[PDB]
Amino acid sequence: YNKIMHLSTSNLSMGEMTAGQICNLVAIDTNQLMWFFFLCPNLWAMPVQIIVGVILLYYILGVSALIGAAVIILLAPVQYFVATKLSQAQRSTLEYSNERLKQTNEMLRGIKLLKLYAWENIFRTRVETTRRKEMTSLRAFAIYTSISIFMNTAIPIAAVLITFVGHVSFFKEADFSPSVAFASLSLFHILVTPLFLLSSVVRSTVKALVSVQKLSEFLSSAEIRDNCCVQIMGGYFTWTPDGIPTLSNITIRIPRGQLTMIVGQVGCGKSSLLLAALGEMQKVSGAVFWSRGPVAYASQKPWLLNATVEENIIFESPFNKQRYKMVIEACSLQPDIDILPHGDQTQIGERGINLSGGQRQRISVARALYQHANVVFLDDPFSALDIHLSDHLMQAGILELLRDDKRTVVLVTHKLQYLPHADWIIAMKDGTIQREGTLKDFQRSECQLFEHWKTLMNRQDQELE
Amino acid sequence: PWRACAKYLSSAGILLLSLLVFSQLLKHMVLVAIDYWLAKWTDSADQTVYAMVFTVLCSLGIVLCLVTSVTVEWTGLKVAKRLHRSLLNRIILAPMRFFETTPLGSILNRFSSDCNTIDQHIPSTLECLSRSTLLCVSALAVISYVTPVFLVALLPLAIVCYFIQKYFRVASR
Amino acid sequence: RAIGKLPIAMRALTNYQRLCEAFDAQGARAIWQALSHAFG
Amino acid sequence: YALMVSNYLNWMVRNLADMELQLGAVKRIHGLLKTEAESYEGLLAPSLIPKNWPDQGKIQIQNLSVRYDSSLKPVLKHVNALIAPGQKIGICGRTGSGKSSFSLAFFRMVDTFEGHIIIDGIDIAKLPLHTLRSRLSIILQDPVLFSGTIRFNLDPERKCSDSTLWEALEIAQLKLVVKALPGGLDAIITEGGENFSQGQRQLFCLARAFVRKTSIFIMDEATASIDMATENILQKVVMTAFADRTVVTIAHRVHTILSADLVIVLKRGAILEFDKPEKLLSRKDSVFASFVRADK
Numbered sequence: 008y009n010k011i012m013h014l015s016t017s018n019l020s021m022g023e024m025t026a027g028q029i030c031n032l033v034a035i036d037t038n039q040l041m042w043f044f045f046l047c048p049n050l051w052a053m054p055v056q057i058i059v060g061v062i063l064l065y066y067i068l069g070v071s072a073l074i075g076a077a078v079i080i081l082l083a084p085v086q087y088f089v090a091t092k093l094s095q096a097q098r099s100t101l102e103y104s105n106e107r108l109k110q111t112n113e114m115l116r117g118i119k120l121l122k123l124y125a126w127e128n129i130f131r132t133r134v135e136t137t138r139r140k141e142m143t144s145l146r147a148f149a150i151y152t153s154i155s156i157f158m159n160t161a162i163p164i165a166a167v168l169i170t171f172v173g174h175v176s177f178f179k180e181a182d183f184s185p186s187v188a189f190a191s192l193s194l195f196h197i198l199v200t201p202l203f204l205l206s207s208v209v210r211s212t213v214k215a216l217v218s219v220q221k222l223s224e225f226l227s228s229a230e231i232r233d234n235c236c237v238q239i240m241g242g243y244f245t246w247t248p249d250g251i252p253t254l255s256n257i258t259i260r261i262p263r264g265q266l267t268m269i270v271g272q273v274g275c276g277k278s279s280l281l282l283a284a285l286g287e288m289q290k291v292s293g294a295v296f297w298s299r300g301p302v303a304y305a306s307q308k309p310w311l312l313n314a315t316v317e318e319n320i321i322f323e324s325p326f327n328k329q330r331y332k333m334v335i336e337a338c339s340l341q342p343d344i345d346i347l348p349h350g351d352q353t354q355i356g357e358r359g360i361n362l363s364g365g366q367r368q369r370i371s372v373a374r375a376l377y378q379h380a381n382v383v384f385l386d387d388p389f390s391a392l393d394i395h396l397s398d399h400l401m402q403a404g405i406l407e408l409l410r411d412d413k414r415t416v417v418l419v420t421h422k423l424q425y426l427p428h429a430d431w432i433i434a435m436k437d438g439t440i441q442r443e444g445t446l447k448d449f450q451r452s453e454c455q456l457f458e459h460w461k462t463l464m465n466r467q468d469q470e471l472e
Numbered sequence: 473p474w475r476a477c478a479k480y481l482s483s484a485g486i487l488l489l490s491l492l493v494f495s496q497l498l499k500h501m502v503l504v505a506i507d508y509w510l511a512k513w514t515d516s517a518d519q520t521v522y523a524m525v526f527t528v529l530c531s532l533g534i535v536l537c538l539v540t541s542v543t544v545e546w547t548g549l550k551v552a553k554r555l556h557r558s559l560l561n562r563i564i565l566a567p568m569r570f571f572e573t574t575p576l577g578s579i580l581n582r583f584s585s586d587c588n589t590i591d592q593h594i595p596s597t598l599e600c601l602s603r604s605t606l607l608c609v610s611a612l613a614v615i616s617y618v619t620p621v622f623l624v625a626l627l628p629l630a631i632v633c634y635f636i637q638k639y640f641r642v643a644s645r
Numbered sequence: 646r647a648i649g650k651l652p653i654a655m656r657a658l659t660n661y662q663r664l665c666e667a668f669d670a671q672g673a674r675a676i677w678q679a680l681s682h683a684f685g
Numbered sequence: 686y687a688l689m690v691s692n693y694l695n696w697m698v699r700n701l702a703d704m705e706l707q708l709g710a711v712k713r714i715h716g717l718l719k720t721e722a723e724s725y726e727g728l729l730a731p732s733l734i735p736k737n738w739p740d741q742g743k744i745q746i747q748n749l750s751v752r753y754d755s756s757l758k759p760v761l762k763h764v765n766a767l768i769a770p771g772q773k774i775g776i777c778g779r780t781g782s783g784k785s786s787f788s789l790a791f792f793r794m795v796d797t798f799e800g801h802i803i804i805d806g807i808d809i810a811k812l813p814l815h816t817l818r819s820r821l822s823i824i825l826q827d828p829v830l831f832s833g834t835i836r837f838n839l840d841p842e843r844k845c846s847d848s849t850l851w852e853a854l855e856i857a858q859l860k861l862v863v864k865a866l867p868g869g870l871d872a873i874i875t876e877g878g879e880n881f882s883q884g885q886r887q888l889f890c891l892a893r894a895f896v897r898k899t900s901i902f903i904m905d906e907a908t909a910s911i912d913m914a915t916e917n918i919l920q921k922v923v924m925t926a927f928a929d930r931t932v933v934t935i936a937h938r939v940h941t942i943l944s945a946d947l948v949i950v951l952k953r954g955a956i957l958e959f960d961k962p963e964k965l966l967s968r969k970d971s972v973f974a975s976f977v978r979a980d981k
């Protein structure tokens with residue numbers, strides 16, 4: 008979790024680790040390493056047990072005990088044979104089960120798209136082929152564990168056969184008392200009692216070795232290193248650490264205590280300026296000039312902690328009840344708290360009640376109002392909402408609550424009707440910022456993009472200021 | 473005596489289940505036979521005729537060990553095949569309100585961890601359980617054979633074993 | 646409530662401080678070397 | 686054998702404890718194994734159903750009212766709408782008023798306690814459900830992409846042509862972004878679509894809706910995540926290229942639903958109006974008129 012708390016979020020998005028693999032590493036591989044440290048003194052106590060077994064065999068029945076002990080020292084090449092075969096089968100087992108887990112989590116979130124588009128048998132056939140490759144690896148594992156269990160039980164009665172046949176034959180005739188026979192049979196059986204455990208020990212060693220490989224693979228990844236509260240000037244920012252820079256030369260200037268808006272197309276740098284100003288992108292060049300302090304944030308995809316509704320508003324703030332009333336009257340969850348079975352003590356999320364979709368956006372921006380953090384960074388709060396709730400979130404909330412105590416807010420919105428309300432607007436085009444300033448500034452120079460926004464609002468008669 | 477245990481034996485098959493319980497009882501019974509012939513042949517002191525019969529029942533112990541090992545892997549492989557793709561074919565035909573009701577991480581924790589436990593952990597638990605249980609009751613039967621006074625002594629240790637297990641199990645759960 | 650809190654060693658900070666003091670003495674060989682020096 | 690039972694009595698009792706302790710996994714998988722059915726069978730014979738049974742978009746909503754489960758309230762009320770053959774009709778309304786459940790009512794996810802919808806003379810409750818959901822097309826607001834590759838995200842069946850993939854990418858207006866990728870139709874989409882943007886994730890999911898070449902498109906609020914210039918270009922290229930097909934659209938912004946032919950306004954699960962939007966704007970006491978004047 009210390010590797011998690013400074014991890015780059017580009018490592019999640021560019022393949023290499025998924026979130027199911029990251030929680031699966033905790034849920035399985037630390038547990039497998041823990042079972043290896045449960046079974047590690049068994050392998051540290053095995054060879055002195057078998058050598059004081061064979062020297063007490065040399066005391067009890069003589070020199071035919073070494074002929075009987077030939078099969079127990081013959082167990083080490085067959086344990087090396089099943090060691091290399093169970094290692095290759097465990098590695099193929101782990102890679103096919105990781106593909107099956109990632110495909111099953113990828114299927115089970117998309118049940119609503121998959122049954123509607125009627126592709127569930129096709130996806131189930133793909134998971135069935137991944138399960139077929141897994142069952143090939145596990146039938147290999149089943150055969151190699153079978154011959155190790157048969158060898159680990161079948162070497163003892165072979166040792167009673169070689170010893171008790173070789174003593175009554177004429178190699179020696181020293182001791183055919185029952186004392187050496189029953190004492191040696193108990194000596195073979197307490198020699199045998201490690202070997203019932205030894206196969207489960209060595210498959211736990213190979214599960215330990217690939218878990219330590221994936222722990223070192225997870226622990227090697229890249230990490231996050233005038234009233235202008237944010238003054239990124241001239242700085243190139245990239246998603247990919249060896250790719251083309253997604254964000255080019257940007258010269259932004261956010262005014263303090265003042266609303267600014269970020270306008271552009273889809274995929275133009277529009278949340279990427281927020282994650283570059285956070286520092287979640289790695290840097291090619293340039294400089295950020297903060298004030299870093301704590302900045303309020305709600306993302307485009309809303310994220311839910313599985314807790315109560317009131318704990319998702321507060322999010323380890325103090326519970327002042329009056330501003331809590333102010334943010335639920337600003338976000339208008341007051342009609343939608345009574346449709347919950349409890350009030351604000353309804354537990355929500357993944358392991359809770361399934362929400363609406365607009366309500367998770369409203370509770371994430373209701374988390375975003377309640378922080379005292381003085382800089383509020385907002386991805387799209389009016390995407391999943393209608394015109395009534397975005398108008399009530401525009402007359403209250405932004406320009407009402409946070410205009411009063413003078414907190415800086417930036418806004419990222421595809422909806423352009425609130426573009427009258429500004430103090431600054433950042434115009435963007437394709438990873439470059441286009442131009443910066445206010446609306447009187449924007450009809451002054453960039454009249455083509457001003458007329459482009461004039462055409463989309465259908466306010467041709469109205470003056471935009 | 474849960475119904476999941478009966479689902480486990482009935483999903484295995486009567487063929488492999490009969491091969492398992494039959495070959496496991498004959499394997500522990502010929503181990504009982506090899507030390508009873510060790511008693512009769514050490515206690516005789518017809519010579520080497522009592523080494524010929526020792527070799528020929530030791531070979532039955534060898535191949536009975538082999539058939540117990542291949543039946544415990546074939547039962548683990550057939551239930552690990554068969555408790556997947558009846559589950560997946562049932563959960564893919566499930567209605568949408570059940571996905572709306574139940575948490576997804578509960579279902580996915582069954583598909584990960586309980587499928588991995590049904591895969592890898594339990595057939596080792598089956599061979600160690602069957603070896604330890606039939607080995608302890610056959611050892612209790614043969615030391616019932618050498619002394620009949622141990623049955624009179626054995627019922628106090630069995631009733632305090634059941635009492636300390638009944639005393640422990642409500643703390644353990 | 647009936648089970649308690651931990652003792653101060655086996656409380657996770659101080660064995661998280663036994664670790665990376667373990668990596669202060671210096672890869673999966675370094676993983677195993679710091680694990681052996683941390684919990685030997 | 687006294688020493689043997691002293692050696693193995695612990696393994697007898699602890700492997701009995703581990704067999705019960707791992708038998709709880711078998712109890713949980715048998716708990717999930719006895720779950721309910723969606724009843725995928727059809728009581729109508731598939732010989733009597735034609736191959737192009739959804740040939741013309743003639744949808745007869747007849748007294749349909751739905752609840753999500755059997756304990757709940759009627760979400761849609763007594764609704765009755767005649768949807769005409771090749772026509773482009775849209776629905777707007779308030780949040781939580783029945784808008785996404787109207788799109789779920791065509792596919793019978795949400796269950797109907799009264800009435801029936803009629804496509805082409807065929808009752809949709811009297812139909813096989815995989816043949817129902819194969820030949821009609823919904824696009825939903827939340828983008829659920831998958832990983833694997835772009836072509837598998839576009840068609841997972843391996844049955845479609847790459848020029849139709851490029852053409853559905855052309856009417857998605859994402860074609861310059863996918864052409865500038867160095868893989869470029871067989872590059873990689875990662876897990877959950879975190880390779881790309883939110884509107885690009887939605888735009889890939891719209892192109893997934895476009896590559897199925899059906900006759901009834903139904904849409905949710907699918908212009909909600911994207912830009913207004915791209916949505917105006919998008920409604921132009923979807924109302925030119927799919928002009929014969931019945932396209933049903935929940936509109937997030939109600940200025941793009943003025944170009945539609947008829948308008949349902951839903952409020953609290955009821956058909957408030959069923960008219961042309963020029964007639965609905967000229968009334969001026971309509972809820973659609975206060976929508977279109979409350980927006981701009």
Ligand SMILES: Nc1ncnc2c1ncn2[C@@H]1O[C@H](COP(=O)(O)OP(=O)(O)OP(=O)(O)O)[C@@H](O)[C@H]1O
Binds near residue numbers: 883
């Ligand atoms: N998490 C990410 N990792 C790598 N590349 C990304 C990521 N997010 C976006 N990109 C790429 O960077 C470009 C810029 O996307 P960006 O995140 O700015 O979208 P956006 O315009 O903010 O989305 P929206 O239109 O929903 O606001 C996109 O073309 C996308 O392919």
Ligand SMILES: Nc1ncnc2c1ncn2[C@@H]1O[C@H](COP(=O)(O)OP(=O)(O)O)[C@@H](O)[C@H]1O
Binds near residue numbers: 753754779
């Ligand atoms: N999965 C669900 N289970 C039960 N009720 C739901 C579910 N989804 C939505 N509802 C209810 O159905 C009503 C209609 O909502 P919906 O059609 O989803 O959104 P809207 O009409 O606001 O776009 C809402 O009031 C909501 O409470």
Ligand SMILES: [Mg+2]
Binds near residue numbers: 277278882883
């Ligand atoms: Mg974005």
Ligand SMILES: [Mg+2]
Binds near residue numbers: 781783784786
């Ligand atoms: Mg809806």
